[PDB]
Structure 1
Amino acid sequence: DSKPQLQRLAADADVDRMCRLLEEDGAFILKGLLPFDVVESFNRELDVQMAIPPPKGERLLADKYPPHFKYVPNVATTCPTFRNTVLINPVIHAICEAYFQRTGDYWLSAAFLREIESGMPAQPFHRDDATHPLMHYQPLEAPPVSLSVIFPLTEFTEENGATEVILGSHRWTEVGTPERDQAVLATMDPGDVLIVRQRVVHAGGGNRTTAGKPRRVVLAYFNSVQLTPFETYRTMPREMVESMTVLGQRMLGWRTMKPSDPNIVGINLIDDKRLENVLQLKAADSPAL
């Protein structure tokens, strides 16, 4: 395409370059971060969840939509491949650690599945600043407090509606009403990852195919520990929590974390002690640390 496209990088790519891509272009792609077997076992875990008949009670998001609406909340609690493998991907966290360098500690606000079936229209262009509305008022220069991480679980094509990203649009004052051709396509294979900076204007593609195969995507939101996690993993059984690594525990809110100075004490604590100490939390990788 005539317009400059989304840079696609190998898993082992340089971190300074990814970080500078995020500030200049606002987005980039990692190629084959997740092995195909990982991707497929994740998909089967999700298949199980979606196969579950609709429950009797209230569902806060689902009840707002038609019954054909496909959605799996907080995948870490029901998809071990995500909890144990995807969530603690070292490349992802290296990016996060560079990205959140000014704001301090980050954790996982949400990780959920979205399936877009044939005949569904594109999303309107938007900035991912609705969940925590205060973000709408954050100046561009301020230390970023949220990172969008997008996992294609089916192929992302021009036809089925690969994610549309407008490069450099995070420097815009408002989203406005940009035309579709201002954006480029995040065409990907399962195992690739799209990483999108805060304030970058984007939109879901919408599935124009007619063969029945639906587009499947898991969206993960990594936020500053200043921001309340949309999904709370506090009801995870202790056995499951302790089977995770320390990084895993920190991501899911089971540990005291640290916003950058001038916060010098930290956050998410109790009795002036670390939450994991009060809980006496064990971890799969705590003898080695």
Structure 2
Amino acid sequence: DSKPQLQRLAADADVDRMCRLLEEDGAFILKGLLPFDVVESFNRELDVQMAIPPPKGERLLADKYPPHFKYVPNVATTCPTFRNTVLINPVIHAICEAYFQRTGDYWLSAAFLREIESGMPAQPFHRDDATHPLMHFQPLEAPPVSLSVIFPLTEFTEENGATEVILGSHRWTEVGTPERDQAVLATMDPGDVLIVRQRVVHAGGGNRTTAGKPRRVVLAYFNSVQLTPFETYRTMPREMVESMTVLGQRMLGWRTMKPSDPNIVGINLIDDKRLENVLQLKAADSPAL
């Protein structure tokens, strides 16, 4: 349409151009980042997690929301294809390093599956600023501390509730009461990615299909290491941790990290030493790098 849509970029495109779209539009789509076999492998792992009956007692997030979204938390611990491939994608990390250049190091606050079955309503318009409420008071020119990375695991279509994004809404002082037609649809295929800047108003669309076709989305939040991870990966067995690369370990909170100056020491340390030395941590590319 004549109303500007989300720009689609090739997976190998220039990182400064991506960085420029984030500042101007607030979001953009990467086309064909993950190959078909990677997506399929991940989807089989996610199939398994959602065939498991939900556990006996407390469900911290699921108890506080009604229908409808199905939910698999912390996919990094149960889905090797996320942990070993998707999580360390070179393009996602090129974007993050540019985006967080003023903030310093970043890590994974959470990654989880959202599944929206046929005939479910939209999500409300919102910013991803509820988990760490202090973000509400961070001004626009402050270095960004959060990036939303949205992976479609099924196709996102007009009918099945493709993510709705109001472009340039990061420049808004207040969210207010925006109507649905102000947003554009992030229609995508599996293997694409939707990247959404801090402060950008958006919503899941809700599935207006009727013939049992669930929409699958894996949401990953990369935050400044200054912000506490929502999901803590500290109970992962040592064997699983050491099978990851250094970068993967850094994402899942197992290493000492470095916020920007004026923090000249770091963060997530003990006995005035790096966590990874105290634990004598090995990694899949320890000698390689």
TM-score, length basis structure 2: 0.98
Distance (whole Å) between structure 1 residues aligned to residue 237 and residue 75 of structure 2: 15
In structure 2, the CA distance between the partners of 1:11 and 1:286, relative to structure 1 (3 Å rule), is same
State the SS of the aligned residue for 1:127. Answer: coil
CA distances 1:113-170 after superposition (whole Å, capped 9, x unpaired): 0011111111111110000000011101100000000000000001101000111110
CA distances 1:45-74 after superposition (whole Å, capped 9, x unpaired): 011111111211211112234587511000
Moved over 3 A (4+): 65-69
Structure-1 residue corresponding to 2:161: 161
CA distances 1:229-250 after superposition (whole Å, capped 9, x unpaired): 0000000000000000000000
CA distances 1:25-47 after superposition (whole Å, capped 9, x unpaired): 00000000011111011011011
Aligned length: 289
Distance (whole Å) between structure 2 residues aligned to residue 24 and residue 121 of structure 1: 30
In structure 2, the CA distance between the partners of 1:215 and 1:90, relative to structure 1 (3 Å rule), is same
Matches within 5 A, 1:138-287: 138-287=138-287
Distance (whole Å) between structure 1 residues aligned to residue 34 and residue 239 of structure 2: 26
In structure 2, the CA distance between the partners of 1:199 and 1:282, relative to structure 1 (3 Å rule), is same
In structure 2, the CA distance between the partners of 1:142 and 1:68, relative to structure 1 (3 Å rule), is closer
State the SS of the aligned residue for 1:265. Answer: coil
Shift of 1:97: 0.1
CA distances 1:199-224 after superposition (whole Å, capped 9, x unpaired): 01111111111111011100000000
Contact 2:160–2:215 (CA<8 Å) still a contact in 1?
A: yes
Identity %: 100
Which runs of 5 or more residues in structure 1 are unaligned?
none
In structure 2, the CA distance between the partners of 1:159 and 1:234, relative to structure 1 (3 Å rule), is same
Distance (whole Å) between structure 1 residues aligned to residue 134 and residue 195 of structure 2: 22
Distance (whole Å) between structure 2 residues aligned to residue 26 and residue 54 of structure 1: 36
TM-score, length basis structure 1: 0.98
In structure 2, the CA distance between the partners of 1:79 and 1:158, relative to structure 1 (3 Å rule), is same
Contact 2:69–2:117 (CA<8 Å) still a contact in 1?
A: no
Distance (whole Å) between structure 2 residues aligned to residue 5 and residue 88 of structure 1: 29
In structure 2, the CA distance between the partners of 1:125 and 1:252, relative to structure 1 (3 Å rule), is same
Contact 2:46–2:79 (CA<8 Å) still a contact in 1?
A: yes
CA distances 1:242-261 after superposition (whole Å, capped 9, x unpaired): 00000000000000000000
Q: Could you say what the CA RMSD is over the residues aligned between the two structures, in angstroms? A: 1.0
State the SS of the aligned residue for 1:249. Answer: helix
CA distances 1:79-135 after superposition (whole Å, capped 9, x unpaired): 000000000000000000000000000000000000111111111111100000000
Contact 2:68–2:120 (CA<8 Å) still a contact in 1?
A: no
State the SS of the aligned residue for 2:88. Answer: coil
Shift of 1:24: 0.4
Which runs of 5 or more residues in structure 2 are unaligned?
none
Contact 2:100–2:143 (CA<8 Å) still a contact in 1?
A: yes
Distance (whole Å) between structure 2 residues aligned to residue 183 and residue 42 of structure 1: 29
Distance (whole Å) between structure 2 residues aligned to residue 68 and residue 4 of structure 1: 30
Distance (whole Å) between structure 2 residues aligned to residue 157 and residue 239 of structure 1: 40
Structure-2 residue corresponding to 1:102: 102
CA distances 1:152-194 after superposition (whole Å, capped 9, x unpaired): 0000001101000111110001111111111111000001000
Structure-1 residue corresponding to 2:78: 78
Distance (whole Å) between structure 2 residues aligned to residue 181 and residue 63 of structure 1: 31
